[PDB]
Amino acid sequence: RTSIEQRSNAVSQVLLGIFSYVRWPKEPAVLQLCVVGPTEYADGLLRGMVQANGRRVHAERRAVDNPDLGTLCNVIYLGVVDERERQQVFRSLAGHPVLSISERGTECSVGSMFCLNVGGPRITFEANLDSIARSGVRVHPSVLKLAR
Amino acid sequence: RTSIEQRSNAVSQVLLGIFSYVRWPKEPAVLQLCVVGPTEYADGLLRGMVQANGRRVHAERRAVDNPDLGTLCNVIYLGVVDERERQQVFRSLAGHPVLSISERGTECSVGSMFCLNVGGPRITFEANLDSIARSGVRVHPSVLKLARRQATP
Ligand SMILES: N[C@@H](Cc1c[nH]c2ccccc12)C(=O)O
């Protein structure tokens, strides 16, 4: 088990944690997670997960230019995208109750609700309060006590 | 348009195709493939592959700044990296017998031997003579029969 695989497992754990503080308007039987864009640490998510409450997280890659990301995804995990592509992605998410998390987040002021920082001894993450308010989903404010 | 799963599966087969025009100075029992940097299309690769002679290809992700890539890897499948990370990777491979293939078709100017173009109806690729010559492996020129017939409607 090398440190990319170990960081990937940790990435899984962190997302599961974050999920426990989010609520969807109409809660689905299976939580759809979409991995979108190039990613380095998503191989654990893609093996599928299960929440403490029993609900299954089904994970799948989807293309950046997939117009239906808003209706196909409950959670999106966003990898490397350029400017045109990210506002392409979020145009598809606008109007829908979707939790968004990006694998890299140097500053996290535009785009995803949450931005991981996977480098370093432990995984940390930042929260985008605007994104969270315009999100469609409900975020228990306790989750901010879990961020940097 | 082609799906992410479809494209992933095809990348597997194009890599198997390329591997068959490549000879290593000391062929290993198990071909070691390393996926480095963020990738969209490597999930097929990472299941492990098998060559037509029955040699297994073992795949795993490694960190961009791992100093021993040239030692740990027979093959590098390279994802999205910045200017400095790319310099790090290809300096790590200098002097070792390593095949390098990029997921995207921009890295053929900067050190990758083959560069995939995953857009379109089929997967095409391009190659760089300079990078190939300094690679330490031997590549048969027929490998372009595979890019040409792929670039064909
Ligand atoms: N090592 C190769 C070098 C080479 C010549 N022409 C090529 C065309 C494509 C790829 C490699 C080559 C050889 O057998 O000579």
Numbering used by the authors:
A (entry chain B): 38 to 185
B (entry chain A): 38 to 190
Copy text from the publication:
The YfiBNR system contains three protein members and modulates intracellular c-di-GMP levels in response to signals received in the periplasm. YfiN is repressed by specific interaction between its periplasmic PAS domain and the periplasmic protein YfiR. YfiB is an OmpA/Pal-like outer-membrane lipoprotein that can activate YfiN by sequestering YfiR in an unknown manner. Previous studies suggested that in response to cell stress, YfiB in the outer membrane sequesters the periplasmic protein YfiR, releasing its inhibition of YfiN on the inner membrane and thus inducing the diguanylate cyclase activity of YfiN to allow c-di-GMP production.
Moreover, we found that Vitamin B6 (VB6) or L-Trp can bind YfiR with an affinity in the ten millimolar range. Structural analyses revealed that the VB6 and L-Trp molecules are bound at the periphery of the YfiR dimer, but not at the dimer interface. Interestingly, VB6 and L-Trp were found to occupy the same hydrophobic pocket, formed by L166/I169/V176/P178/L181 of YfiR, which is also a binding pocket for F57 of YfiB, as observed in the YfiB-YfiR complex. To answer the question whether competition of VB6 or L-Trp for the YfiB F57-binding pocket of YfiR plays an essential role in inhibiting biofilm formation, we measured the binding affinities of VB6 and L-Trp for YfiR via BIAcore experiments. The results showed relatively weak Kd values of 35.2 mmol/L and 76.9 mmol/L for VB6 and L-Trp, respectively. The over-expression of YfiBL43P induced strong surface attachment and much slower growth of the yfiB-L43P strain, and as expected, a certain amount of VB6 or L-Trp (4–6 mmol/L for VB6 and 6–10 mmol/L for L-Trp) could reduce the surface attachment. In E. coli, mutants with decreased tryptophan synthesis show greater biofilm formation, and matured biofilm is degraded by L-tryptophan addition. Based on our results, we concluded that VB6 or L-Trp can bind to YfiR, however, VB6 or L-Trp alone may have little effects in interrupting the YfiB-YfiR interaction, the mechanism by which VB6 or L-Trp inhibits biofilm formation remains unclear and requires further investigation.
